Amino acid sequence: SLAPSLAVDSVFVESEELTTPLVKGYVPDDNGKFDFDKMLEQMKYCGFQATNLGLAIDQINEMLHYDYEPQPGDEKKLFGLGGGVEGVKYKPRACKIFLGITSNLISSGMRDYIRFLVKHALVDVVVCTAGGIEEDFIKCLAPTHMGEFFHDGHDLRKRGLNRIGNLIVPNKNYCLFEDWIMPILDKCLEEQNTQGTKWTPSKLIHRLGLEINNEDSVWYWAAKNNIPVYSPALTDGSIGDMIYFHSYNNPGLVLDLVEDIRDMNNEPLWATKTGCIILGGGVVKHHIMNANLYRNGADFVVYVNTAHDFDGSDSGARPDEAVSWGKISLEAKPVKVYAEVTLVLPLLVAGSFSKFLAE
Amino acid sequence: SLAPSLAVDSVFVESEELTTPLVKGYVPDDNGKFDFDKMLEQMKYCGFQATNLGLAIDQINEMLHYDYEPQPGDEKKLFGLGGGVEGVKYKPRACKIFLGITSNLISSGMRDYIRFLVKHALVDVVVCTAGGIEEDFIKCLAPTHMGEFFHDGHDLRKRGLNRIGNLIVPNKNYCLFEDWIMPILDKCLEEQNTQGTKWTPSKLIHRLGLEINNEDSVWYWAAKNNIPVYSPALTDGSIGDMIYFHSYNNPGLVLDLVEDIRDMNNEPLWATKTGCIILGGGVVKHHIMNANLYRNGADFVVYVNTAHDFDGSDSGARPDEAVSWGKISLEAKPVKVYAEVTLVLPLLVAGSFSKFLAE
Amino acid sequence: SLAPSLAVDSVFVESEELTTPLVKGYVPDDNGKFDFDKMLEQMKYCGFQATNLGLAIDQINEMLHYDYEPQPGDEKKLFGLGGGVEGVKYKPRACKIFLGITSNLISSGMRDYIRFLVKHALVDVVVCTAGGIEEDFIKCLAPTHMGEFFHDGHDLRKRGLNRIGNLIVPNKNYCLFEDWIMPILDKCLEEQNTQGTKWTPSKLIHRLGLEINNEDSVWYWAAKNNIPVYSPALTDGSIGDMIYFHSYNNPGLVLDLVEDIRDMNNEPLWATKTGCIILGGGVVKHHIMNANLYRNGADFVVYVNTAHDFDGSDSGARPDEAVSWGKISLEAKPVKVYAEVTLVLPLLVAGSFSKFLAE
Amino acid sequence: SLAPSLAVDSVFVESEELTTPLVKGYVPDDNGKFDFDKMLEQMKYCGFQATNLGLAIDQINEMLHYDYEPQPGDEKKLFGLGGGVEGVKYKPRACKIFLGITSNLISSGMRDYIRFLVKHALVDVVVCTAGGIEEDFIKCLAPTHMGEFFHDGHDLRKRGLNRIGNLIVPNKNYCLFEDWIMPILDKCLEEQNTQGTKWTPSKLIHRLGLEINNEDSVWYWAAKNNIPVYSPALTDGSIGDMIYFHSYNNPGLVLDLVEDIRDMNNEPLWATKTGCIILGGGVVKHHIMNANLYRNGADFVVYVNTAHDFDGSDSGARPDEAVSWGKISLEAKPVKVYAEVTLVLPLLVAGSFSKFLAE
Ligand SMILES: NC(=O)c1ccc[n+]([C@@H]2O[C@H](COP(=O)([O-])OP(=O)(O)OC[C@H]3O[C@@H](n4cnc5c(N)ncnc54)[C@H](O)[C@@H]3O)[C@@H](O)[C@H]2O)c1
Ligand SMILES: NC(=O)c1ccc[n+]([C@@H]2O[C@H](COP(=O)([O-])OP(=O)(O)OC[C@H]3O[C@@H](n4cnc5c(N)ncnc54)[C@H](O)[C@@H]3O)[C@@H](O)[C@H]2O)c1
Ligand SMILES: NC(=O)c1ccc[n+]([C@@H]2O[C@H](COP(=O)([O-])OP(=O)(O)OC[C@H]3O[C@@H](n4cnc5c(N)ncnc54)[C@H](O)[C@@H]3O)[C@@H](O)[C@H]2O)c1
Ligand SMILES: NC(=O)c1ccc[n+]([C@@H]2O[C@H](COP(=O)([O-])OP(=O)(O)OC[C@H]3O[C@@H](n4cnc5c(N)ncnc54)[C@H](O)[C@@H]3O)[C@@H](O)[C@H]2O)c1
């Protein structure tokens, strides 16, 4: 017959002519050569989350390269200056950068990428939950092993093997942590009692960083570079266990949240611009983004996480939700990559931080 | 031709005869009648997450009905006794029950289901992040409104409308919270200074529950029933904001984590059995499950959350991972429902808690 | 000191006064009674996906109750008339309804809810992938059993036990299917050869429905009610296996896609309005939504699935994407519930289809 | 006091000493240099999905390098020989390789990586849904543009702009496709009528590949290298639309599934070993894995997809489920990467296919 006219008209509508960029991947070379830099450059034009990874690289580079001319009479406010450690290259920046990491990222090999950022003061403030605090120190005492996601936990428990995803922390590691930290907690309580020291999570994490005295440790580098590290639920993990058992041997330690919320929420107020790089969700994400409401919004933003907004969670909220709160500025152009961080962070570092440090 | 013999042999293997239950849904009645009780009863045999919901109902009923005969010379250790509020039905239990909730569940209408559990002391300890603490009190001052997931946050911010998923909290609600809480913080600091009171998150949440003095509030009922509520990152939210601004008007408040980790981790040690019901992930999940390591494992367990274990997160970890740590006992038969809680909790309550209370 | 003025101004902005509905859950009764109808009624005001479930119930009720006055000279075009089966209640409708289901929903106990809809001609066209076609017939020969998600597949294979999620299909079930279907395929090929019959997936599924001749079967009811069932990849499953082995014993069967794409894409063109209810994603979702482009868009739409749009997949695309294509009309108000269907479909049926049938 | 002895004993259990590999990331160089090869090499030891990506690279390299000594009297059965195109490097292999791709991967820039594999006959059989068939040809006529996930579909439709995730296909592209394909369908129907040609999806896709006659096209290279391409729902997309409208101008085309299920399910039976690389889920995943049941299982397997098994879907099923069916051999060591393919495929190619081609 003749096809229905409504179908013809609906399937074959006219379209606007577009001048936007085109979708195009990197073409691997016909001789087997593989150009990683062209691969990385084309991610922005590959679509779906590869495109968001490219936009996130762009966003971090805007943080690293932001500059301005101070108002008459003002001096320039700079960040990333470092703690003057011999031989360590630092690069001053006009944008202050906050890093949030979930604890499992320190369990993973991302620890080595994060350490690189903190060693060179390429971020200025870190928020990390308690697991990521303690496991950085524990890794200076004993390693975490490769395992598998599907191995019966009954068998692991009978062997004293604690599972974190497809990783294994033998429980002996925590006995070694106990041996290391108990004399430090004794000294901290002695200083509280005799010198009036008022402990908070950030002050304790600074002290533990100096104590571990080991260049393999992220929080050692944070302490050496005077990078504050906040962790308002610092007792939610093995450090909490150590505080628990310590307190029956030596009672009276106080760990205060109030001083640390003053200090955290004041962190974004001096800088001309702030950038936030949030790897994972939960407390570290809300703590950083809420602090940035105090300056009427973060100016540059990257989220990388596996959450989605359909459950109403803070973890899953899009950057757009944070705009409604004032936690992201009205002028920002934020980026979320929907991905597991171990697949993403290495290429983010290659495309932004490392290139910047090489200038 | 003749089909390949390897294909014949591989496609048509013999099978073992099984005596396990059969998959079978509820058959709605041909006249339009719908029997919700038969619907609920058949979930266990429907497959996929409906089956897990049925198993979770079974698991909670095992918590509610667990009983034992004390050893010679011992008395029976009971829970769920309540605070003797007039007219309120309570039901003593030999299993102690921990409830963990993410903050957004209090933003949602799940607040009414959770309030029911706390009012009747059908749970004994709650862990809830700061958002769920404050928004329960705020809802006694002003309501949260229905919105949508896709409404530009630039427009919302210009209108002072804070978005939580598809919900809206007008910022005026937080000004009302400020008016309500500032005199309380003044009094708490006065008691710290003159009576030596040592504030912790759980002690403060108890006090705020009594202060709101309103039967619509979950944490009012927790305080009246002497149900401890822990929240180790209590500053990660609007209460943190209020503490911040209060502290410039009236400095010196201390909010201690150490006493609260002693108290939290001792909560599981008296009971003959413990059950854990964890709605959502993050801090509330780790805090409860880790506490239960101190008794060598929780005995009954239900998780309901939208996370998955592939990212190595604590939120996404299966119950099997907690077994490896000793946080779930070797003899437990735990259940996870992979689902958004607002779709699940009402039917869990119908199938377990409500039926129990009606006995 | 004095708190920073920028922080004061940013945290305490003024807000617009709102007249939108309020978030409010159902309050279970203090004596243990549980009112499922009030539970269901309040889902719309509970937030997150409970709200979307309430909106989806509303959307389906709009399909079931849509009515109009024909233009002068026209008669009213009605659907849901049924096939005149004795004793079966039917309810004519002016909105034509398409149902899409993934194969695993027939493996599950949702088979009983879907059968209810098809028996009463509460939907007019179904699209279902091959697994859901064959397993409906197989369940008339032998049942599917309950199993578990975590049981080593090496052990299951050695026992001839095929796993579908937490369900088990003993391989003997497929040998029984072979015995049942081979004489039918013989007859179909005989009719092709002697009567010129031109087989398509929808024509074959109709024939298999009549052959099974069993009121337990969804596709039996579809055939009796002259509900077309499309499945353009009908060979992607056990029916494909049976066609394969049959063809070496008796070659020449032809199964044509061309006639079936004419017939599928013409299905939406007569009705005054169309509604689409898509349970799961993949082929069934694209096939139905694309067909509705031929009328310039579906008028009412519900999606229920576990996919997300971040991967660019057709499965994960929001209704908004289908609007851009013309597959959903510009005036529609579509609804997606982000959830596993076994947790959702029973309450959708209770709130819409069953209530409608009871009128 | 003294800490409870049960807590001491439970928190500080003894652990087995392990000899398994250690978690360790790549350490970016302190001068800003970034070694992509060491990055890639360390993924296996980074944890979570980076580890699975490393294992997937290993699995593909096992496919590419598998070799064997034929039994006495047999000759070696080889694959990847190519179609003798001048200048194109091919590498014979004893393992036959199946590639499955969802349609959106051809919409994306992954088209360029996939084309590389097909051009060099580094895979032997492809299964791709209809969207990925047509959009490869359409891209030879007009490009796909970059867009965004959040742009109102009402506005896009009024402009004739079809959205695929964050990509845009102007509808004019489909009018150009119509102009290109209608004379081909005319000729195919002429050959059916005058020469008895029996069209199937794979035979049509071969013909369209030769017709486009363009080295930018994946399916051109498949046809030139005699790589069969299966697509049992080939009408589920724009090719289906074109067949629809063509059939009213020129009726009688038949597109048969039966011959194509014989041919697909026979593809795995000759090779000494088979490997399956499945990018995305749905039909392409089931079609390939089910075919491999016919040889009693695939020997090497990589899945990369964003699905999870909790919904019982075929898309979300772990490799372990396919073992239960016999679709994966009992001796295989399969790998799934839980990730969006655009973030994963480039590094899979760099680590396996490209290195292999360079030998
Ligand atoms: N994970 C550990 O190693 C460990 C150890 C001890 C204590 N804990 C405690 O558990 C509690 C909760 O842990 P948490 O705050 O680190 O967050 P979490 O593990 O609850 O994760 C929060 C969300 O962040 C996202 N996320 C997590 N890992 C991701 C990844 N690799 N890639 C992308 N997104 C990811 C996910 O959406 C997840 O749901 C903390 O208080 C922590 O101290 C954790
Ligand atoms: N959400 C709010 O209303 C709000 C308000 C103020 C502050 N905050 C703060 O954000 C921080 C993180 O929030 P959080 O600890 O409540 O958890 P979260 O929002 O980070 O969620 C943790 C994980 O729990 C799961 N989850 C969340 N909601 C779920 C749901 N409805 N159904 C099933 N699973 C769900 C998800 O996997 C999610 O990734 C807290 O410190 C909180 O105080 C939240
Ligand atoms: N699953 C079986 O029982 C079975 C048996 C034989 C053959 N197959 C074949 O596998 C192929 C692919 O299967 P399919 O088309 O049914 O879809 P699928 O299993 O590939 O699912 C497609 C998407 O739909 C969503 N989905 C699936 N189940 C869901 C659920 N319970 N709740 C919410 N969303 C859900 C998910 O996002 C999933 O990724 C088909 O050709 C089918 O014939 C399946
Ligand atoms: N997507 C298009 O461009 C397009 C165009 C026309 C027609 N269609 C039709 O839609 C139907 C369904 O599409 P489909 O079979 O391609 O699969 P799908 O889009 O239904 O995806 C199936 C599952 O595969 C996984 N997946 C999809 N994209 C992924 C990604 N980038 N990374 C990781 N995992 C991913 C996801 O779990 C998804 O649920 C097909 O018949 C197709 O022809 C699609």
PDB file of C-alpha atoms in Angstrom, chain A residues 104-105 129 135 149-158 160-166 169 171 174 201 231-238 240-245 247-248 251-259 261-263 265-266 269 282-284 286-288 290 293-294 296 306 309-314 318 320-327 329-333 340, chain B residues 104 129 135 149-158 160-166 169 171 174 201 231-238 240-245 247-248 251-259 261-263 265-266 269 282-284 286-288 290 293-294 296 306 309-314 318 320-327 329-333 340:
ATOM      1  CA  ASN A 104      38.958   2.017  50.716  1.00  0.00           C
ATOM      2  CA  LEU A 105      41.008   4.205  48.371  1.00  0.00           C
ATOM      3  CA  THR A 129      37.357   8.686  56.900  1.00  0.00           C
ATOM      4  CA  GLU A 135      45.462   1.940  56.968  1.00  0.00           C
ATOM      5  CA  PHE A 149      35.680 -10.800  46.006  1.00  0.00           C
ATOM      6  CA  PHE A 150      34.264 -14.363  46.197  1.00  0.00           C
ATOM      7  CA  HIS A 151      35.983 -16.300  48.965  1.00  0.00           C
ATOM      8  CA  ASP A 152      33.837 -17.577  51.844  1.00  0.00           C
ATOM      9  CA  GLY A 153      34.169 -15.265  54.832  1.00  0.00           C
ATOM     10  CA  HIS A 154      33.796 -18.183  57.242  1.00  0.00           C
ATOM     11  CA  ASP A 155      37.091 -19.576  55.965  1.00  0.00           C
ATOM     12  CA  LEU A 156      38.754 -16.151  56.077  1.00  0.00           C
ATOM     13  CA  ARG A 157      37.650 -15.467  59.659  1.00  0.00           C
ATOM     14  CA  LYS A 158      38.991 -18.830  60.857  1.00  0.00           C
ATOM     15  CA  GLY A 160      42.201 -14.206  60.839  1.00  0.00           C
ATOM     16  CA  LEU A 161      41.999 -12.624  57.363  1.00  0.00           C
ATOM     17  CA  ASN A 162      39.939  -9.431  57.097  1.00  0.00           C
ATOM     18  CA  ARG A 163      38.504  -8.826  53.615  1.00  0.00           C
ATOM     19  CA  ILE A 164      38.176  -5.393  51.978  1.00  0.00           C
ATOM     20  CA  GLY A 165      36.643  -6.004  48.566  1.00  0.00           C
ATOM     21  CA  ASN A 166      39.235  -8.142  46.761  1.00  0.00           C
ATOM     22  CA  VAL A 169      44.430  -7.355  55.718  1.00  0.00           C
ATOM     23  CA  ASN A 171      44.675  -9.329  61.557  1.00  0.00           C
ATOM     24  CA  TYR A 174      46.187  -4.559  63.601  1.00  0.00           C
ATOM     25  CA  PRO A 201      40.798  14.618  64.903  1.00  0.00           C
ATOM     26  CA  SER A 231      37.952  13.146  59.869  1.00  0.00           C
ATOM     27  CA  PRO A 232      34.966  13.926  62.101  1.00  0.00           C
ATOM     28  CA  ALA A 233      34.097  10.237  62.691  1.00  0.00           C
ATOM     29  CA  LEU A 234      37.699   9.310  63.487  1.00  0.00           C
ATOM     30  CA  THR A 235      36.550   6.648  65.955  1.00  0.00           C
ATOM     31  CA  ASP A 236      34.702   4.710  63.183  1.00  0.00           C
ATOM     32  CA  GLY A 237      37.436   2.174  62.581  1.00  0.00           C
ATOM     33  CA  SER A 238      40.560   0.643  64.093  1.00  0.00           C
ATOM     34  CA  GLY A 240      38.453   3.858  67.420  1.00  0.00           C
ATOM     35  CA  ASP A 241      39.276   0.341  68.617  1.00  0.00           C
ATOM     36  CA  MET A 242      42.741   1.478  69.799  1.00  0.00           C
ATOM     37  CA  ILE A 243      41.199   4.471  71.647  1.00  0.00           C
ATOM     38  CA  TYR A 244      38.697   2.078  73.239  1.00  0.00           C
ATOM     39  CA  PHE A 245      41.297  -0.354  74.584  1.00  0.00           C
ATOM     40  CA  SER A 247      41.034   4.124  77.545  1.00  0.00           C
ATOM     41  CA  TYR A 248      40.690   1.169  79.943  1.00  0.00           C
ATOM     42  CA  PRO A 251      41.455   6.889  80.898  1.00  0.00           C
ATOM     43  CA  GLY A 252      40.770  10.541  80.191  1.00  0.00           C
ATOM     44  CA  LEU A 253      41.597  11.240  76.522  1.00  0.00           C
ATOM     45  CA  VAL A 254      39.213  13.761  74.951  1.00  0.00           C
ATOM     46  CA  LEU A 255      38.776  14.080  71.168  1.00  0.00           C
ATOM     47  CA  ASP A 256      36.749  17.207  70.359  1.00  0.00           C
ATOM     48  CA  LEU A 257      34.579  17.843  67.287  1.00  0.00           C
ATOM     49  CA  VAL A 258      33.721  21.484  68.003  1.00  0.00           C
ATOM     50  CA  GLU A 259      37.150  23.026  67.384  1.00  0.00           C
ATOM     51  CA  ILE A 261      34.162  22.117  62.721  1.00  0.00           C
ATOM     52  CA  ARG A 262      35.243  25.719  63.274  1.00  0.00           C
ATOM     53  CA  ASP A 263      38.547  24.957  61.592  1.00  0.00           C
ATOM     54  CA  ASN A 265      34.362  25.370  57.805  1.00  0.00           C
ATOM     55  CA  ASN A 266      36.825  28.265  57.868  1.00  0.00           C
ATOM     56  CA  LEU A 269      37.087  31.479  53.223  1.00  0.00           C
ATOM     57  CA  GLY A 282      29.700   9.717  52.339  1.00  0.00           C
ATOM     58  CA  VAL A 283      31.095  11.961  55.057  1.00  0.00           C
ATOM     59  CA  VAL A 284      34.085  13.179  53.054  1.00  0.00           C
ATOM     60  CA  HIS A 286      29.323  16.251  52.544  1.00  0.00           C
ATOM     61  CA  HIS A 287      32.017  17.668  54.855  1.00  0.00           C
ATOM     62  CA  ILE A 288      33.925  19.357  52.000  1.00  0.00           C
ATOM     63  CA  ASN A 290      29.149  21.915  53.093  1.00  0.00           C
ATOM     64  CA  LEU A 293      28.794  26.867  51.406  1.00  0.00           C
ATOM     65  CA  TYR A 294      30.514  29.194  53.887  1.00  0.00           C
ATOM     66  CA  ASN A 296      28.864  30.894  48.935  1.00  0.00           C
ATOM     67  CA  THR A 306      29.694   4.910  41.832  1.00  0.00           C
ATOM     68  CA  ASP A 309      20.870  10.074  42.834  1.00  0.00           C
ATOM     69  CA  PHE A 310      17.689   7.922  42.713  1.00  0.00           C
ATOM     70  CA  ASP A 311      17.998   6.881  46.378  1.00  0.00           C
ATOM     71  CA  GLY A 312      18.093  10.487  47.622  1.00  0.00           C
ATOM     72  CA  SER A 313      21.447   9.867  49.271  1.00  0.00           C
ATOM     73  CA  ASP A 314      24.044  12.541  49.849  1.00  0.00           C
ATOM     74  CA  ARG A 318      24.587  15.184  41.445  1.00  0.00           C
ATOM     75  CA  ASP A 320      23.321  20.112  40.571  1.00  0.00           C
ATOM     76  CA  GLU A 321      21.889  19.270  43.995  1.00  0.00           C
ATOM     77  CA  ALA A 322      24.833  20.966  45.695  1.00  0.00           C
ATOM     78  CA  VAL A 323      24.158  24.074  43.594  1.00  0.00           C
ATOM     79  CA  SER A 324      20.666  24.274  45.132  1.00  0.00           C
ATOM     80  CA  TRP A 325      22.266  24.368  48.608  1.00  0.00           C
ATOM     81  CA  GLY A 326      24.879  26.999  47.739  1.00  0.00           C
ATOM     82  CA  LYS A 327      27.692  24.461  48.222  1.00  0.00           C
ATOM     83  CA  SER A 329      28.712  28.408  43.217  1.00  0.00           C
ATOM     84  CA  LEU A 330      26.130  29.558  40.707  1.00  0.00           C
ATOM     85  CA  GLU A 331      28.891  30.177  38.123  1.00  0.00           C
ATOM     86  CA  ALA A 332      30.713  26.830  38.457  1.00  0.00           C
ATOM     87  CA  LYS A 333      30.652  24.207  35.652  1.00  0.00           C
ATOM     88  CA  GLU A 340      34.975   3.225  40.238  1.00  0.00           C
TER      89      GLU A 340
ATOM     90  CA  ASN B 104      17.886  10.868  53.981  1.00  0.00           C
ATOM     91  CA  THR B 129      24.130  10.465  60.773  1.00  0.00           C
ATOM     92  CA  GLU B 135      15.873  17.005  60.280  1.00  0.00           C
ATOM     93  CA  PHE B 149      14.819  15.122  40.954  1.00  0.00           C
ATOM     94  CA  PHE B 150      15.165  17.241  37.772  1.00  0.00           C
ATOM     95  CA  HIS B 151      14.733  20.915  38.600  1.00  0.00           C
ATOM     96  CA  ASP B 152      17.665  23.251  37.917  1.00  0.00           C
ATOM     97  CA  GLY B 153      19.553  23.936  41.135  1.00  0.00           C
ATOM     98  CA  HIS B 154      20.382  27.469  39.999  1.00  0.00           C
ATOM     99  CA  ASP B 155      16.682  28.315  40.144  1.00  0.00           C
ATOM    100  CA  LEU B 156      16.260  26.565  43.500  1.00  0.00           C
ATOM    101  CA  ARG B 157      19.213  28.377  45.087  1.00  0.00           C
ATOM    102  CA  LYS B 158      17.899  31.777  43.968  1.00  0.00           C
ATOM    103  CA  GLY B 160      16.458  29.539  48.928  1.00  0.00           C
ATOM    104  CA  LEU B 161      15.196  25.982  48.312  1.00  0.00           C
ATOM    105  CA  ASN B 162      17.539  23.172  49.370  1.00  0.00           C
ATOM    106  CA  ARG B 163      17.028  19.939  47.411  1.00  0.00           C
ATOM    107  CA  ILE B 164      17.304  16.437  48.905  1.00  0.00           C
ATOM    108  CA  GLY B 165      16.600  14.029  46.064  1.00  0.00           C
ATOM    109  CA  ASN B 166      13.004  14.812  45.063  1.00  0.00           C
ATOM    110  CA  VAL B 169      13.695  21.967  52.556  1.00  0.00           C
ATOM    111  CA  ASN B 171      16.064  27.470  54.026  1.00  0.00           C
ATOM    112  CA  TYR B 174      17.122  26.168  59.164  1.00  0.00           C
ATOM    113  CA  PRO B 201      27.049  13.116  70.547  1.00  0.00           C
ATOM    114  CA  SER B 231      26.340   9.790  65.644  1.00  0.00           C
ATOM    115  CA  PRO B 232      30.136  10.102  65.675  1.00  0.00           C
ATOM    116  CA  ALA B 233      30.215  12.726  62.878  1.00  0.00           C
ATOM    117  CA  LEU B 234      27.473  14.814  64.488  1.00  0.00           C
ATOM    118  CA  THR B 235      29.028  18.023  63.153  1.00  0.00           C
ATOM    119  CA  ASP B 236      28.579  16.862  59.506  1.00  0.00           C
ATOM    120  CA  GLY B 237      25.400  18.797  58.861  1.00  0.00           C
ATOM    121  CA  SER B 238      23.269  21.669  60.127  1.00  0.00           C
ATOM    122  CA  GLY B 240      27.545  21.381  62.862  1.00  0.00           C
ATOM    123  CA  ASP B 241      26.614  24.751  61.362  1.00  0.00           C
ATOM    124  CA  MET B 242      24.709  25.722  64.545  1.00  0.00           C
ATOM    125  CA  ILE B 243      27.693  24.674  66.725  1.00  0.00           C
ATOM    126  CA  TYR B 244      29.954  26.741  64.459  1.00  0.00           C
ATOM    127  CA  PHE B 245      27.933  29.954  64.731  1.00  0.00           C
ATOM    128  CA  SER B 247      30.840  29.044  69.160  1.00  0.00           C
ATOM    129  CA  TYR B 248      31.629  32.601  68.009  1.00  0.00           C
ATOM    130  CA  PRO B 251      32.962  29.712  72.917  1.00  0.00           C
ATOM    131  CA  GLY B 252      34.074  26.635  74.816  1.00  0.00           C
ATOM    132  CA  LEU B 253      31.650  23.782  74.025  1.00  0.00           C
ATOM    133  CA  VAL B 254      33.400  20.405  73.822  1.00  0.00           C
ATOM    134  CA  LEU B 255      31.848  17.401  72.043  1.00  0.00           C
ATOM    135  CA  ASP B 256      33.862  14.257  72.816  1.00  0.00           C
ATOM    136  CA  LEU B 257      34.170  11.109  70.685  1.00  0.00           C
ATOM    137  CA  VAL B 258      36.167   9.004  73.153  1.00  0.00           C
ATOM    138  CA  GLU B 259      33.449   8.421  75.759  1.00  0.00           C
ATOM    139  CA  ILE B 261      33.194   4.953  71.355  1.00  0.00           C
ATOM    140  CA  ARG B 262      33.520   3.251  74.738  1.00  0.00           C
ATOM    141  CA  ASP B 263      29.760   3.398  75.145  1.00  0.00           C
ATOM    142  CA  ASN B 265      31.272  -0.622  71.460  1.00  0.00           C
ATOM    143  CA  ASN B 266      30.040  -1.856  74.838  1.00  0.00           C
ATOM    144  CA  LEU B 269      28.201  -7.198  75.076  1.00  0.00           C
ATOM    145  CA  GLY B 282      28.211   4.607  55.339  1.00  0.00           C
ATOM    146  CA  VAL B 283      29.076   5.414  58.940  1.00  0.00           C
ATOM    147  CA  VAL B 284      25.906   3.952  60.435  1.00  0.00           C
ATOM    148  CA  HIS B 286      30.284   0.362  59.872  1.00  0.00           C
ATOM    149  CA  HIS B 287      29.670   1.753  63.379  1.00  0.00           C
ATOM    150  CA  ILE B 288      27.049  -0.898  64.240  1.00  0.00           C
ATOM    151  CA  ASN B 290      32.151  -3.017  64.057  1.00  0.00           C
ATOM    152  CA  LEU B 293      32.809  -7.559  66.591  1.00  0.00           C
ATOM    153  CA  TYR B 294      33.307  -6.892  70.311  1.00  0.00           C
ATOM    154  CA  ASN B 296      32.476 -11.942  68.325  1.00  0.00           C
ATOM    155  CA  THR B 306      21.473   0.313  46.993  1.00  0.00           C
ATOM    156  CA  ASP B 309      30.474  -4.611  46.488  1.00  0.00           C
ATOM    157  CA  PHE B 310      32.447  -4.089  43.232  1.00  0.00           C
ATOM    158  CA  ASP B 311      33.859  -0.727  44.376  1.00  0.00           C
ATOM    159  CA  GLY B 312      35.351  -2.191  47.569  1.00  0.00           C
ATOM    160  CA  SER B 313      33.337   0.238  49.667  1.00  0.00           C
ATOM    161  CA  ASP B 314      32.211  -0.451  53.200  1.00  0.00           C
ATOM    162  CA  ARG B 318      28.023  -8.012  51.416  1.00  0.00           C
ATOM    163  CA  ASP B 320      29.843 -12.194  53.836  1.00  0.00           C
ATOM    164  CA  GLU B 321      32.591  -9.576  54.093  1.00  0.00           C
ATOM    165  CA  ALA B 322      31.525  -8.737  57.642  1.00  0.00           C
ATOM    166  CA  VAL B 323      31.757 -12.442  58.506  1.00  0.00           C
ATOM    167  CA  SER B 324      35.452 -12.369  57.533  1.00  0.00           C
ATOM    168  CA  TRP B 325      36.004  -9.558  60.074  1.00  0.00           C
ATOM    169  CA  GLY B 326      34.094 -11.241  62.906  1.00  0.00           C
ATOM    170  CA  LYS B 327      31.419  -8.516  62.810  1.00  0.00           C
ATOM    171  CA  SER B 329      28.962 -14.403  63.797  1.00  0.00           C
ATOM    172  CA  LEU B 330      30.030 -17.595  62.078  1.00  0.00           C
ATOM    173  CA  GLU B 331      26.588 -19.134  62.755  1.00  0.00           C
ATOM    174  CA  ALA B 332      24.434 -16.234  61.496  1.00  0.00           C
ATOM    175  CA  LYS B 333      22.344 -16.517  58.286  1.00  0.00           C
ATOM    176  CA  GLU B 340      15.919   1.630  47.826  1.00  0.00           C
TER     177      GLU B 340
END
